[PDB]
């Protein structure tokens, strides 16, 4: 439209209306030129490939991509508190995306000083893959997401994908994708880009904790009409066999018949927060629960949704069972325990097994006058008819959606790291700097990106008489206030915030 | 109405779906001891990234498995015993044991070994195409913790021979 | 309605989670109902 006319405004607010929420986030980005405008084969061989489990083959691309997939991109800590305290459920509905105020730059370096200037004739190529033809990397929980604080300017992550590998070498079935081979819009300093996306129907994420446990659903005042076997012997002695049947009732609640059982489990090793309780050996990798695929072992992370610990044992956590985030300014490798935030999965204890406990016991033999009854422990249990379970909670720092892998079959597609599983997730958005040949002119672009999401709410009609548990800021003097910048201007998220506060009946 | 039969092979594997160029924002437990010697205990955490791709958090896991005995087309590699029936995976129904054939859809063999085949899992047609999402028929599905570790007791694992459906599993059916 | 633009979360009236003999704002074993503490109306914040 014009060089001196802005192609968009800064829209950054949340609107609460009835049963829905509309969040709008605008950020400022910068796009470097990656790989010097080249597609480059990459493999563990370039990385050194010490192990076959880490072996990979793929391509790095000159393109970047936009990732808003985290909850913090669209919700302020106050908005998140408003939502998790007042609502039993929520879910995304519509998606509106805008890319505007493009500013391409040319970098020229003479001696020790680099001079930056405007290039008014350069373009920026942006396109979305709405047929899902490219590999989808947005469900892998990567960095490069829009910053939680709106005043932060962020760098766009480089796009890359992996295809079939044999060691570091490829195979005849491996695929190569030229992102230039897609149609794409080209933007100069006056052009803008926008599209709208409709979330496909998903179930509301359950932002609540059950007030009942799966095994306590009974009326405590009344007997069952069912009987259970109370006594197999009359007393101590030879040939004391007998059959005695008590009725199941309030006094013995463990023996009663139940219609439903807790969900599946794949046991995790538990690690105590207080280290001297831990074994004096290296078990991070050797003691981990894993799954093997085509000869490659993969840690089970986070795994099926299970309780992090039993009641009264706050210190313990599943080895790879829970989500572990970083604190602001945390190093990359071998950080101390204080540096990270290990999420708690306690709210799901009412219906799900503890991650570090056996699911139960099964009989391993036939008893007889010769042989005693023998029971083994169930370390892993698949789905059984009559199971009910809770999905993993979503967090303010956590992912929103994932792509359901395209397959002949799946069960309960809800992603294991939490959030909303989708066959057609929000499409990847690819961007690169169109090369200007000089060998090229060193160049980068700067821009404004805005994303708007409509959320549907599920209110509580609950009749609970006593007050709830709510997320609240602590009222005490402190050097800083939570979820705010410090004296040096560094925004930080001091804690992960779960979504489960309000309660429901089971 | 039936679903379309899949007549394609995935060009990706379930564990490689990540962006190879970018770290995750999630941490894993890297190191449980500082150094050799007594009373060394510590919890160190690292970012999951391109260099170590086995420990990254993933949203989906491979489908269920019921292990088949591995049999080689080279007669001298196989055991010198009659294990056709005795070493075969079977299921029992009302006292009658039925061989598991072909069974759940699983990769026939690992990449690099074409001489081995599942004892009763093969129609000898090859099911190597579905390995991307499916466990190998002759391999354990994975490992699980068998105990609570402690200062006295080391962390103990165990092999999963059969795994039923779990939420988050994806799989391919058998080819036509 | 509260239409605050405050970035950081508010202070909210909450029930504490800890194991205890009785439930606050509930009846005891004898059926007596009791209100454990006086609850004020002022939690959310405004500018002056």
């Amino acid at each position, epitope marked *: 439209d014009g060089v001196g006319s802005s192609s968009g405004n800064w829209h950054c607010d949340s609107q609460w209306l009835g049963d829905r929420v509309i969040t709008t986030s605008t950020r400022t980005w910068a796009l470097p030129t990656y790989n010097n405008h080249l597609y480059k084969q990459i493999s563990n061989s370039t990385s050194g490939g010490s192990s076959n489990d880490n072996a990979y083959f793929g391509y790095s691309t000159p393109w970047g991509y936009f990732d808003f997939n985290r909850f913090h991109c669209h919700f302020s800590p106050r908005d998140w508190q408003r939502l998790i305290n007042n609502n039993w459920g929520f879910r995304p509905k519509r998606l509106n995306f805008k890319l505007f105020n493009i500013q391409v730059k040319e970098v020229t370096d003479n001696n020790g000083v680099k001079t930056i200037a405007n290039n008014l004739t350069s373009t920026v190529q942006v396109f979305t893959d709405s047929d899902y033809q490219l590999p989808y990397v947005l469900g892998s929980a990567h960095e490069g997401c829009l910053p939680p604080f709106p005043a932060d300017v962020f760098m766009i992550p480089q796009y890359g994908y992996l295809t079939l590998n044999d060691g570091s070498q490829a195979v005849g079935r491996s695929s190569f994708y030229c992102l230039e081979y897609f149609p794409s819009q080209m933007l100069r300093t006056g052009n803008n880009f926008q599209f709208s996306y409709e979330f496909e129907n998903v179930p509301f994420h359950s932002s609540y904790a059950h007030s009942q446990s799966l095994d306590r659903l009974m009326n405590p005042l009344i007997d069952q009409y069912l009987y259970y076997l109370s006594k197999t012997i009359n007393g101590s002695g030879q040939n004391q066999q007998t059959l005695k049947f008590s009725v199941a009732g309030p006094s013995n609640m463990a023996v009663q018949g139940r219609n439903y059982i807790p969900g599946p489990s794949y046991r995790q090793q538990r690690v105590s927060t207080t280290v001297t309780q831990n074994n004096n050996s290296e078990f991070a990798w050797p003691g981990a629960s894993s799954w093997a695929l085509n000869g490659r072992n993969s840690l089970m992370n986070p795994g099926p949704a299970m309780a*992090s610990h039993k009641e009264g044992e706050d*210190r313990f956590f599943p080895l790879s069972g829970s989500l572990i985030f970083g604190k602001q300014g945390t190093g990359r490798d071998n950080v*101390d325990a204080d540096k990270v935030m290990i999420t708690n999965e306690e709210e799901i204890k009412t219906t799900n097994p503890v991650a570090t406990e056996s699911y139960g016991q099964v009989a391993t033999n036939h008893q007889s006058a010769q042989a005693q009854a023998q029971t083994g422990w169930v370390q892993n249990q698949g789905i059984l008819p009559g199971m009910v379970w809770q999905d993993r909670d979503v967090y303010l720092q956590g992912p929103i959606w994932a792509k359901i892998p395209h397959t002949d079959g799946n069960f309960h597609p809800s992603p294991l790291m939490g959030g909303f599983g989708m066959k057609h997730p929000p499409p990847q958005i690819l961007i690169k700097n169109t090369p200007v040949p000089a060998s090229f002119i060193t160049q980068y672009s700067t821009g404004q990106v805005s994303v708007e999401i409509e959320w549907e709410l599920q209110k509580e009609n609950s009749k609970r008489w006593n007050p709830e548990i709510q997320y609240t800021s602590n009222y005490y003097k402190s*050097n800083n206030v939570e979820f705010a910048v410090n004296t040096e201007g560094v925004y930080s998220e001091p804690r992960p915030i779960g979504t489960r506060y309000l309660t429901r009946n089971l | 109405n039936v679903p379309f039969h899949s007549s394609y092979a995935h060009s990706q594997s379930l564990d490689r779906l990540m962006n190879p160029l970018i770290d995750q924002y999630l941490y894993y437990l890297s190191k449980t001891i500082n150094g050799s010697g007594q009373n060394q205990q510590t919890l160190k955490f690292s970012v999951a990234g391109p260099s170590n791709m086995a420990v990254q958090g993933r949203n989906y896991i491979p489908g269920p498995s019921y292990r088949q005995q591995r049999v080689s087309t080279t007669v001298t590699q196989n055991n010198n015993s009659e294990f056709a029936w005795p070493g075969a995976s079977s299921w029992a129904l009302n006292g009658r044991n039925s061989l598991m054939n072909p069974g759940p859809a699983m990769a026939s063999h690992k990449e690099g070994e074409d001489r081995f085949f599942p004892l009763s899992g093969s129609l000898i047609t090859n099911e190597e195409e579905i390995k991307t999402t499916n466990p190998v028929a002759t391999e354990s599905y994975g490992q699980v913790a068998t105990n609570h570790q402690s200062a006295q007791a080391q962390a103990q694992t165990g092999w999963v021979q059969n795994q039923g459906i779990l939420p988050g599993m994806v799989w391919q059916d058998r080819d036509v | 309605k509260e239409n605050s633009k405050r970035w950081n979360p508010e202070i909210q009236y909450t029930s504490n989670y*800890y194991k205890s003999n009785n439930v606050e704002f509930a009846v005891n074993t004898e059926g007596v109902y009791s209100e454990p503490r006086p609850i004020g109306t002022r939690y959310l914040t405004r500018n002056l």
Partner: antibody
Amino acid sequence: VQLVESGGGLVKPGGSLRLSCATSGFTFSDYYMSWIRQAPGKGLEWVSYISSSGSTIYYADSVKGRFTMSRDNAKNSLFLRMNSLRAEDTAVYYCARDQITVDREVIRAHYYYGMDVWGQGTTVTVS
Amino acid sequence: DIQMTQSPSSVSASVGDRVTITCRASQGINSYLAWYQQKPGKAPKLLIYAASSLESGVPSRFSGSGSGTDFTLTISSLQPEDFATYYCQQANSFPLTFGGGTKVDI
């Protein structure tokens, strides 16, 4: 924030004594509490440590098996019950609380940053 | 268990002087070290936690450093209020242990 110890007394060896700590100014359930004693003319010595819930309790080897630490959340107070009191149990006993407040969402050790708030303490003499 | 050592046992200084107190652990305690100052007839006060972090209210002059086995407490431009006994405790693992203590002497 304030911690007030009471119940200190002079008792003969083998006697049973109960100490209390009344707390005000902070939410009692958000912190882990610990008893610490100081023998006269000597450095401070850690005694016991209790979880916010009260489910988990730790003790010093010397006091183990004779001292019981309890917690009443409804009426804020911290209790130490001392049985089989012996000669060198004479100390000034301090009620202290961890600097790191308990956060339900995360699993962590709360004693890493030490104990920010200490009570005046109660003298206990055994003879 | 982990033992703590403070050298010197006691130190004498004038107002405005710079005082350094050093304590080291028998085994590495990461950065989990706390410094306490105690005055006769009064409960201990926490000045420094997690090796280099200064507790609120505590004066700017007080400082601390070190990691692993060795830690150090530094007082610069010492004041009248500053004369007391100082204890360093390792908060790495149970049982919590304290150093013998250093008594700053007028």
